[PDB]
Design a protein around this ligand. Structure first.
Ligand SMILES: *[C@H]1O[C@H](CO)[C@@H](O)[C@H](O)[C@@H]1O
Lengths: 323, 4
């Protein structure tokens, strides 16, 4: 049976986490995203000026092209990418997927052309939302799941420290106590779960649902919740230059917690200070609006406080405080 | 930050 550990590393301010992946012999730094199901990479099919600053995949060398297949993806932050498809060997933390579909970029939006920290994304959401056409393909995880010791992956994302992606096994030294599991609704292709209630510093409220997304930087919640939270932060104000609520970096922030199947997952106020807003001497809050979409995005801000198990049996998600 |  297989299992492996891939090490992730946060970029500046923990904006994103990158992990090396070897494709057909070439190592690329990818952003592992539990919010999507496409494995796409910068390739030699891109204009030479866009290959700059990146490690790129050369399909010609080792991939097998899927004639007539294309892919096109759009993310929540408005970025997008599109291209063609090849099958190749993909290795993550010593676990190799043979014949994995690799989406070679032909076009990338400005956000991607501006970010030299990654060379593409590896999606870990359910394969049901993979964008390959005419026939969708399976994610790296779905491709290898049957060969793992256990059909799950686990993640420990840290604040300005290397973290891990455990594939096929749980590392009990990564958390305190025992894990608590909750059921997942994969109907929209996400690792979606329910919270029974929340505590925002001195205020508590009713439950809601959200997705566990390693690919989103912040904790995105309903506007009501956001308001409630910053109403308790002396001098907090919205700053469009920064992207949301900002405050004095020295401010004492309240904790934020959610009740999940009887387990209280708490994000300490210190992790809610994202970092410099880069607009003077204010810091950006880790909690921001979800734009009225109807469900919350449990992004990296949240994940830095827990060890999370993504289990395909159920499916279910397990949580415990990071050790 | 991003939203992916
Ligand atoms: C993950 O688990 C596999 C199967 O137990 C081991 O062979 C591997 O070394 C790692 O512990």
């Amino acid at each position: 049976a297989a299992s492996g550990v891939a090490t992730n590393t946060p970029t500046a301010n923990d904006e994103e986490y990158i992990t090396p992946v070897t494709i057909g012999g070439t190592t690329l730094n990818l952003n592992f995203d539990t919010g999507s199901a496409d494995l796409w990479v910068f390739s030699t099919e891109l204009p030479a000026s866009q290959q700059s600053g990146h490690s790129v995949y050369n399909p010609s060398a080792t991939g097998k092209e899927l004639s007539g297949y294309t892919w096109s993806i759009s993310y929540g932050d408005g970025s997008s990418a599109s291209g063609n498809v090849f099958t190749d060997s993909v290795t993550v933390g010593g676990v190799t997927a043979h014949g994995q579909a690799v989406q070679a970029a032909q076009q990338i939006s400005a956000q991607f052309q501006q970010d030299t920290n990654n060379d593409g994304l590896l999606g870990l959401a359910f394969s049901s939302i993979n964008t390959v056409q005419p026939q969708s393909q399976t994610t790296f995880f779905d491709t290898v799941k049957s060969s793992l010791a256990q059909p799950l992956f686990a993640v420990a994302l840290k604040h300005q420290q290397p973290g891990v992606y455990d594939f096929g096994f749980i590392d009990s030294s990564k958390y305190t106590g025992s894990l608590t599991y909750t059921g997942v609704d994969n109907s929209q292709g996400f690792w979606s779960f329910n919270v029974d209630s929340y505590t925002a510093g001195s205020q508590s409220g009713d439950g809601f649902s959200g997705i566990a997304d390693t690919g989103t930087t912040l904790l995105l919640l309903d506007d009501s919740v956001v308001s409630q939270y910053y109403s308790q932060v002396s001098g907090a104000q919205q700053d469009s230059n920064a992207g949301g609520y900002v405050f004095d970096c020295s401010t004492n922030l309240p904790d934020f917690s959610v009740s999940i199947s009887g387990y209280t997952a708490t994000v300490p106020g210190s992790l809610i200070n994202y970092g410099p807003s880069g607009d003077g001497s204010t810091c950006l809050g880790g909690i921001q609006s979800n734009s009225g979409i109807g469900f919350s995005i449990f992004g990296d801000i949240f994940l830095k406080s827990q060890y999370v198990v993504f289990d395909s049996d159920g499916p279910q998600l397990g949580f415990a405080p990071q050790a | 930050x991003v939203v992916x």
